[PDB]
Amino acid sequence: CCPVNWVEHERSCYWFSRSGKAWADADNYCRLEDAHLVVVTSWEEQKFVQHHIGPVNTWMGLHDQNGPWKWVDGTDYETGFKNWRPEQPDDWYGHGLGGGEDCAHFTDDGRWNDDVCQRPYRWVCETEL
Ligand SMILES: CC(=O)N[C@@H]1[C@@H](O)[C@@H](O)[C@@H](CO)O[C@@H]1O
Ligand SMILES: [Ca+2]
Ligand SMILES: [Ca+2]
Numbered sequence: 001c002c003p004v005n006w007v008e009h010e011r012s013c014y015w016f017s018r019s020g021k022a023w024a025d026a027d028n029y030c031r032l033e034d035a036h037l038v039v040v041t042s043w044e045e046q047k048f049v050q051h052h053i054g055p056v057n058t059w060m061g062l063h064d065q066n067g068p069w070k071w072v073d074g075t076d077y078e079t080g081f082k083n084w085r086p087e088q089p090d091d092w093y094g095h096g097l098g099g100g101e102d103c104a105h106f107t108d109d110g111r112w113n114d115d116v117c118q119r120p121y122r123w124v125c126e127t128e129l
């Protein structure tokens with residue numbers, strides 16, 4: 001029951017961009033498709049997303065812009081699945097662009113990193129059947 005060009009996996013529909021956007025723009029894009037930036041809650045979902053994105057930095061629906069880490073659909077962060085690269089998240093200021101790092105993304109090996117929300121990365125939308 002997914003729209004055309006979306007991939008079905010375990011009762012969810014996924015859309016994989018092939019262009020980049022800043023996190024806020026990617027978030028708005030997903031909402032306009034009645035969807036949300038991907039929310040990863042299991043190792044099997046993590047492996048499925050990794051297969052389709054390949055070795056490319058790609059935004060997910062996890063951020064700490066207003067305080068603590070939150071998933072865009074209200075899924076609890078603390079008790080949920082996490083796949084940070086060791087030493088991440090680190091809220092790095094050293095990029096010199098202003099502020100720390102408030103948006104999560106998959107890195108080239110699948111492990112997560114927090115980075116500057118303005119960066120243009122590919123993104124994934126998800127909707128639940
Ligand atoms: C893309 C990526 O992994 N970026 C990270 C950045 O977010 C920050 O953690 C930095 C710390 O030295 O290490 C990397 O450059
Ligand atoms: Ca999900
Ligand atoms: Ca942060």
Ligand SMILES: [Ca+2]
Pocket residue numbers: 088089090091092101113114115
């Ligand atoms: Ca980081």
